[PDB]
PDB file of all heavy atoms in Angstrom:
ATOM      1  N   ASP A   1      67.370 -28.658 -75.147  1.00 48.91           N
ATOM      2  CA  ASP A   1      66.976 -27.807 -74.026  1.00 48.91           C
ATOM      3  C   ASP A   1      67.544 -28.335 -72.707  1.00 48.91           C
ATOM      4  O   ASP A   1      66.936 -29.185 -72.046  1.00 48.91           O
ATOM      5  CB  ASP A   1      65.459 -27.709 -73.960  1.00 48.91           C
ATOM      6  CG  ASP A   1      64.998 -26.753 -72.897  1.00 48.91           C
ATOM      7  OD1 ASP A   1      65.861 -26.135 -72.224  1.00 48.91           O
ATOM      8  OD2 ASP A   1      63.767 -26.612 -72.726  1.00 48.91           O
ATOM      9  N   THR A   2      68.684 -27.771 -72.288  1.00 44.89           N
ATOM     10  CA  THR A   2      69.304 -28.204 -71.046  1.00 44.89           C
ATOM     11  C   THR A   2      68.482 -27.835 -69.818  1.00 44.89           C
ATOM     12  O   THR A   2      68.709 -28.403 -68.744  1.00 44.89           O
ATOM     13  CB  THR A   2      70.702 -27.613 -70.893  1.00 44.89           C
ATOM     14  OG1 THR A   2      70.615 -26.190 -70.937  1.00 44.89           O
ATOM     15  CG2 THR A   2      71.652 -28.083 -71.974  1.00 44.89           C
ATOM     16  N   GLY A   3      67.560 -26.892 -69.946  1.00 44.40           N
ATOM     17  CA  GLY A   3      66.716 -26.482 -68.847  1.00 44.40           C
ATOM     18  C   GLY A   3      65.457 -27.289 -68.651  1.00 44.40           C
ATOM     19  O   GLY A   3      64.663 -26.958 -67.763  1.00 44.40           O
ATOM     20  N   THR A   4      65.240 -28.322 -69.455  1.00 41.54           N
ATOM     21  CA  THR A   4      64.101 -29.219 -69.307  1.00 41.54           C
ATOM     22  C   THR A   4      64.639 -30.574 -68.868  1.00 41.54           C
ATOM     23  O   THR A   4      65.609 -31.070 -69.440  1.00 41.54           O
ATOM     24  CB  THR A   4      63.312 -29.325 -70.623  1.00 41.54           C
ATOM     25  OG1 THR A   4      62.640 -28.085 -70.854  1.00 41.54           O
ATOM     26  CG2 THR A   4      62.277 -30.435 -70.572  1.00 41.54           C
ATOM     27  N   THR A   5      64.021 -31.163 -67.841  1.00 40.90           N
ATOM     28  CA  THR A   5      64.550 -32.408 -67.278  1.00 40.90           C
ATOM     29  C   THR A   5      64.383 -33.588 -68.232  1.00 40.90           C
ATOM     30  O   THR A   5      65.300 -34.404 -68.388  1.00 40.90           O
ATOM     31  CB  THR A   5      63.817 -32.733 -65.967  1.00 40.90           C
ATOM     32  OG1 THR A   5      63.748 -31.582 -65.120  1.00 40.90           O
ATOM     33  CG2 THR A   5      64.498 -33.877 -65.225  1.00 40.90           C
ATOM     34  N   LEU A   6      63.190 -33.732 -68.800  1.00 40.25           N
ATOM     35  CA  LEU A   6      62.783 -34.954 -69.473  1.00 40.25           C
ATOM     36  C   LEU A   6      62.852 -34.831 -70.996  1.00 40.25           C
ATOM     37  O   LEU A   6      63.156 -33.777 -71.562  1.00 40.25           O
ATOM     38  CB  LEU A   6      61.370 -35.359 -69.020  1.00 40.25           C
ATOM     39  CG  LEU A   6      61.194 -35.500 -67.503  1.00 40.25           C
ATOM     40  CD1 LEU A   6      59.804 -36.033 -67.184  1.00 40.25           C
ATOM     41  CD2 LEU A   6      62.256 -36.394 -66.881  1.00 40.25           C
ATOM     42  N   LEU A   7      62.580 -35.960 -71.653  1.00 37.15           N
ATOM     43  CA  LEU A   7      62.521 -36.064 -73.104  1.00 37.15           C
ATOM     44  C   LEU A   7      61.052 -36.110 -73.509  1.00 37.15           C
ATOM     45  O   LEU A   7      60.336 -37.044 -73.126  1.00 37.15           O
ATOM     46  CB  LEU A   7      63.257 -37.335 -73.529  1.00 37.15           C
ATOM     47  CG  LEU A   7      63.203 -37.740 -75.000  1.00 37.15           C
ATOM     48  CD1 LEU A   7      63.654 -36.611 -75.907  1.00 37.15           C
ATOM     49  CD2 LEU A   7      64.049 -38.974 -75.223  1.00 37.15           C
ATOM     50  N   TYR A   8      60.602 -35.095 -74.259  1.00 35.45           N
ATOM     51  CA  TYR A   8      59.205 -34.959 -74.670  1.00 35.45           C
ATOM     52  C   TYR A   8      59.120 -35.167 -76.175  1.00 35.45           C
ATOM     53  O   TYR A   8      59.709 -34.394 -76.940  1.00 35.45           O
ATOM     54  CB  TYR A   8      58.636 -33.591 -74.286  1.00 35.45           C
ATOM     55  CG  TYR A   8      58.542 -33.375 -72.791  1.00 35.45           C
ATOM     56  CD1 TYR A   8      59.603 -32.836 -72.073  1.00 35.45           C
ATOM     57  CD2 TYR A   8      57.405 -33.737 -72.088  1.00 35.45           C
ATOM     58  CE1 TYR A   8      59.527 -32.660 -70.711  1.00 35.45           C
ATOM     59  CE2 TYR A   8      57.316 -33.560 -70.717  1.00 35.45           C
ATOM     60  CZ  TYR A   8      58.386 -33.020 -70.027  1.00 35.45           C
ATOM     61  OH  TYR A   8      58.348 -32.840 -68.670  1.00 35.45           O
ATOM     62  N   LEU A   9      58.396 -36.201 -76.586  1.00 39.58           N
ATOM     63  CA  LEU A   9      58.340 -36.638 -77.973  1.00 39.58           C
ATOM     64  C   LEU A   9      56.901 -36.889 -78.388  1.00 39.58           C
ATOM     65  O   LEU A   9      55.994 -36.934 -77.549  1.00 39.58           O
ATOM     66  CB  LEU A   9      59.195 -37.899 -78.155  1.00 39.58           C
ATOM     67  CG  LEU A   9      60.701 -37.672 -77.994  1.00 39.58           C
ATOM     68  CD1 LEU A   9      61.415 -39.012 -78.001  1.00 39.58           C
ATOM     69  CD2 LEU A   9      61.240 -36.757 -79.085  1.00 39.58           C
ATOM     70  N   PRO A  10      56.648 -37.077 -79.688  1.00 41.89           N
ATOM     71  CA  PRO A  10      55.267 -37.286 -80.126  1.00 41.89           C
ATOM     72  C   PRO A  10      54.644 -38.504 -79.458  1.00 41.89           C
ATOM     73  O   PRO A  10      55.319 -39.475 -79.125  1.00 41.89           O
ATOM     74  CB  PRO A  10      55.396 -37.478 -81.642  1.00 41.89           C
ATOM     75  CG  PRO A  10      56.646 -36.714 -81.987  1.00 41.89           C
ATOM     76  CD  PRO A  10      57.562 -36.977 -80.833  1.00 41.89           C
ATOM     77  N   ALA A  11      53.323 -38.445 -79.294  1.00 45.15           N
ATOM     78  CA  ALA A  11      52.614 -39.483 -78.559  1.00 45.15           C
ATOM     79  C   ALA A  11      52.808 -40.862 -79.159  1.00 45.15           C
ATOM     80  O   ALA A  11      52.808 -41.857 -78.425  1.00 45.15           O
ATOM     81  CB  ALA A  11      51.133 -39.140 -78.494  1.00 45.15           C
ATOM     82  N   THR A  12      52.931 -40.952 -80.481  1.00 45.59           N
ATOM     83  CA  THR A  12      53.163 -42.232 -81.140  1.00 45.59           C
ATOM     84  C   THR A  12      54.471 -42.856 -80.664  1.00 45.59           C
ATOM     85  O   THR A  12      54.528 -44.056 -80.362  1.00 45.59           O
ATOM     86  CB  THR A  12      53.228 -41.982 -82.645  1.00 45.59           C
ATOM     87  OG1 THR A  12      54.078 -40.845 -82.863  1.00 45.59           O
ATOM     88  CG2 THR A  12      51.850 -41.724 -83.230  1.00 45.59           C
ATOM     89  N   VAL A  13      55.541 -42.050 -80.620  1.00 46.88           N
ATOM     90  CA  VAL A  13      56.867 -42.525 -80.228  1.00 46.88           C
ATOM     91  C   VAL A  13      56.855 -42.953 -78.767  1.00 46.88           C
ATOM     92  O   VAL A  13      57.392 -44.004 -78.390  1.00 46.88           O
ATOM     93  CB  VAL A  13      57.888 -41.398 -80.466  1.00 46.88           C
ATOM     94  CG1 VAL A  13      59.261 -41.821 -80.008  1.00 46.88           C
ATOM     95  CG2 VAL A  13      57.893 -40.970 -81.924  1.00 46.88           C
ATOM     96  N   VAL A  14      56.235 -42.132 -77.929  1.00 46.06           N
ATOM     97  CA  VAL A  14      56.214 -42.378 -76.497  1.00 46.06           C
ATOM     98  C   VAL A  14      55.405 -43.630 -76.177  1.00 46.06           C
ATOM     99  O   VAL A  14      55.801 -44.436 -75.324  1.00 46.06           O
ATOM    100  CB  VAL A  14      55.688 -41.116 -75.783  1.00 46.06           C
ATOM    101  CG1 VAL A  14      55.505 -41.350 -74.298  1.00 46.06           C
ATOM    102  CG2 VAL A  14      56.619 -39.938 -76.056  1.00 46.06           C
ATOM    103  N   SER A  15      54.274 -43.817 -76.855  1.00 46.70           N
ATOM    104  CA  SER A  15      53.490 -45.034 -76.676  1.00 46.70           C
ATOM    105  C   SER A  15      54.297 -46.264 -77.073  1.00 46.70           C
ATOM    106  O   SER A  15      54.244 -47.299 -76.395  1.00 46.70           O
ATOM    107  CB  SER A  15      52.214 -44.923 -77.507  1.00 46.70           C
ATOM    108  OG  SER A  15      51.393 -46.067 -77.346  1.00 46.70           O
ATOM    109  N   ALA A  16      55.027 -46.184 -78.188  1.00 46.09           N
ATOM    110  CA  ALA A  16      55.851 -47.307 -78.613  1.00 46.09           C
ATOM    111  C   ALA A  16      56.901 -47.655 -77.573  1.00 46.09           C
ATOM    112  O   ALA A  16      57.199 -48.833 -77.361  1.00 46.09           O
ATOM    113  CB  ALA A  16      56.508 -47.008 -79.951  1.00 46.09           C
ATOM    114  N   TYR A  17      57.490 -46.656 -76.920  1.00 43.03           N
ATOM    115  CA  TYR A  17      58.469 -46.929 -75.876  1.00 43.03           C
ATOM    116  C   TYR A  17      57.819 -47.651 -74.691  1.00 43.03           C
ATOM    117  O   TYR A  17      58.252 -48.733 -74.282  1.00 43.03           O
ATOM    118  CB  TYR A  17      59.163 -45.618 -75.432  1.00 43.03           C
ATOM    119  CG  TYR A  17      60.134 -45.896 -74.309  1.00 43.03           C
ATOM    120  CD1 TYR A  17      61.392 -46.404 -74.580  1.00 43.03           C
ATOM    121  CD2 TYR A  17      59.764 -45.723 -72.979  1.00 43.03           C
ATOM    122  CE1 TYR A  17      62.265 -46.721 -73.556  1.00 43.03           C
ATOM    123  CE2 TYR A  17      60.616 -46.059 -71.953  1.00 43.03           C
ATOM    124  CZ  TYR A  17      61.864 -46.570 -72.236  1.00 43.03           C
ATOM    125  OH  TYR A  17      62.673 -46.920 -71.188  1.00 43.03           O
ATOM    126  N   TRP A  18      56.769 -47.056 -74.127  1.00 47.40           N
ATOM    127  CA  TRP A  18      56.207 -47.572 -72.882  1.00 47.40           C
ATOM    128  C   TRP A  18      55.476 -48.893 -73.088  1.00 47.40           C
ATOM    129  O   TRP A  18      55.312 -49.655 -72.124  1.00 47.40           O
ATOM    130  CB  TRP A  18      55.325 -46.519 -72.179  1.00 47.40           C
ATOM    131  CG  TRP A  18      56.174 -45.421 -71.618  1.00 47.40           C
ATOM    132  CD1 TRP A  18      56.277 -44.136 -72.080  1.00 47.40           C
ATOM    133  CD2 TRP A  18      57.109 -45.535 -70.542  1.00 47.40           C
ATOM    134  NE1 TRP A  18      57.208 -43.445 -71.346  1.00 47.40           N
ATOM    135  CE2 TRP A  18      57.735 -44.281 -70.397  1.00 47.40           C
ATOM    136  CE3 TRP A  18      57.482 -46.577 -69.678  1.00 47.40           C
ATOM    137  CZ2 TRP A  18      58.720 -44.054 -69.457  1.00 47.40           C
ATOM    138  CZ3 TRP A  18      58.448 -46.338 -68.723  1.00 47.40           C
ATOM    139  CH2 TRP A  18      59.054 -45.082 -68.618  1.00 47.40           C
ATOM    140  N   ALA A  19      55.071 -49.201 -74.320  1.00 47.82           N
ATOM    141  CA  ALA A  19      54.488 -50.507 -74.608  1.00 47.82           C
ATOM    142  C   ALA A  19      55.457 -51.647 -74.338  1.00 47.82           C
ATOM    143  O   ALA A  19      55.022 -52.795 -74.192  1.00 47.82           O
ATOM    144  CB  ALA A  19      54.039 -50.555 -76.058  1.00 47.82           C
ATOM    145  N   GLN A  20      56.753 -51.361 -74.287  1.00 46.85           N
ATOM    146  CA  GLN A  20      57.763 -52.373 -74.008  1.00 46.85           C
ATOM    147  C   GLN A  20      58.066 -52.512 -72.521  1.00 46.85           C
ATOM    148  O   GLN A  20      58.991 -53.241 -72.158  1.00 46.85           O
ATOM    149  CB  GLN A  20      59.039 -52.084 -74.809  1.00 46.85           C
ATOM    150  CG  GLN A  20      58.817 -52.093 -76.306  1.00 46.85           C
ATOM    151  CD  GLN A  20      58.186 -53.384 -76.772  1.00 46.85           C
ATOM    152  OE1 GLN A  20      58.640 -54.467 -76.408  1.00 46.85           O
ATOM    153  NE2 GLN A  20      57.123 -53.283 -77.552  1.00 46.85           N
ATOM    154  N   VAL A  21      57.298 -51.853 -71.657  1.00 45.36           N
ATOM    155  CA  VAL A  21      57.479 -51.922 -70.213  1.00 45.36           C
ATOM    156  C   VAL A  21      56.185 -52.479 -69.617  1.00 45.36           C
ATOM    157  O   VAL A  21      55.152 -51.809 -69.619  1.00 45.36           O
ATOM    158  CB  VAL A  21      57.817 -50.544 -69.631  1.00 45.36           C
ATOM    159  CG1 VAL A  21      58.002 -50.637 -68.136  1.00 45.36           C
ATOM    160  CG2 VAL A  21      59.054 -49.974 -70.298  1.00 45.36           C
ATOM    161  N   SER A  22      56.233 -53.703 -69.092  1.00 44.97           N
ATOM    162  CA  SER A  22      55.025 -54.318 -68.561  1.00 44.97           C
ATOM    163  C   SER A  22      54.455 -53.490 -67.418  1.00 44.97           C
ATOM    164  O   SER A  22      55.159 -53.138 -66.467  1.00 44.97           O
ATOM    165  CB  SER A  22      55.333 -55.730 -68.077  1.00 44.97           C
ATOM    166  OG  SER A  22      55.461 -56.615 -69.167  1.00 44.97           O
ATOM    167  N   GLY A  23      53.174 -53.173 -67.523  1.00 45.99           N
ATOM    168  CA  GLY A  23      52.496 -52.423 -66.504  1.00 45.99           C
ATOM    169  C   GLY A  23      52.602 -50.920 -66.635  1.00 45.99           C
ATOM    170  O   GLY A  23      51.963 -50.209 -65.859  1.00 45.99           O
ATOM    171  N   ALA A  24      53.359 -50.410 -67.603  1.00 47.74           N
ATOM    172  CA  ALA A  24      53.424 -48.970 -67.780  1.00 47.74           C
ATOM    173  C   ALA A  24      52.133 -48.450 -68.398  1.00 47.74           C
ATOM    174  O   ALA A  24      51.492 -49.124 -69.212  1.00 47.74           O
ATOM    175  CB  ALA A  24      54.597 -48.604 -68.681  1.00 47.74           C
ATOM    176  N   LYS A  25      51.750 -47.236 -68.007  1.00 48.74           N
ATOM    177  CA  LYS A  25      50.522 -46.643 -68.502  1.00 48.74           C
ATOM    178  C   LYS A  25      50.613 -45.138 -68.335  1.00 48.74           C
ATOM    179  O   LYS A  25      51.379 -44.635 -67.510  1.00 48.74           O
ATOM    180  CB  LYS A  25      49.320 -47.168 -67.724  1.00 48.74           C
ATOM    181  CG  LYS A  25      49.357 -46.778 -66.259  1.00 48.74           C
ATOM    182  CD  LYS A  25      48.217 -47.410 -65.483  1.00 48.74           C
ATOM    183  N   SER A  26      49.814 -44.426 -69.119  1.00 49.42           N
ATOM    184  CA  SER A  26      49.677 -42.994 -68.944  1.00 49.42           C
ATOM    185  C   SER A  26      48.611 -42.726 -67.898  1.00 49.42           C
ATOM    186  O   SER A  26      47.478 -43.199 -68.020  1.00 49.42           O
ATOM    187  CB  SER A  26      49.300 -42.319 -70.252  1.00 49.42           C
ATOM    188  OG  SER A  26      49.246 -40.919 -70.058  1.00 49.42           O
ATOM    189  N   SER A  27      48.982 -41.964 -66.884  1.00 50.21           N
ATOM    190  CA  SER A  27      48.109 -41.609 -65.778  1.00 50.21           C
ATOM    191  C   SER A  27      47.756 -40.129 -65.889  1.00 50.21           C
ATOM    192  O   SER A  27      48.622 -39.259 -65.748  1.00 50.21           O
ATOM    193  CB  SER A  27      48.808 -41.883 -64.456  1.00 50.21           C
ATOM    194  OG  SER A  27      48.100 -41.244 -63.420  1.00 50.21           O
ATOM    195  N   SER A  28      46.480 -39.838 -66.131  1.00 51.48           N
ATOM    196  CA  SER A  28      46.061 -38.444 -66.177  1.00 51.48           C
ATOM    197  C   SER A  28      46.197 -37.786 -64.811  1.00 51.48           C
ATOM    198  O   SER A  28      46.508 -36.593 -64.726  1.00 51.48           O
ATOM    199  CB  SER A  28      44.622 -38.330 -66.687  1.00 51.48           C
ATOM    200  OG  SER A  28      43.713 -39.037 -65.858  1.00 51.48           O
TER     201      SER A  28
END
């Protein structure tokens, strides 16, 4: 989808990515 800016993936995959960034968190 060239009309969507970001990469949207399952929550499991996304959590695994951001777990490798110190201080990253999901902000509601």
Side-chain angles (χ1 to χ4, degrees), residues 1-24 26-28:
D1 185 2
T2 58
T4 290
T5 312
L6 305 186
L7 174 54
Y8 294 89
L9 292 172
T12 46
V13 177
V14 174
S15 181
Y17 178 81
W18 289 108
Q20 299 305 312
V21 180
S22 284
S26 183
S27 166
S28 59

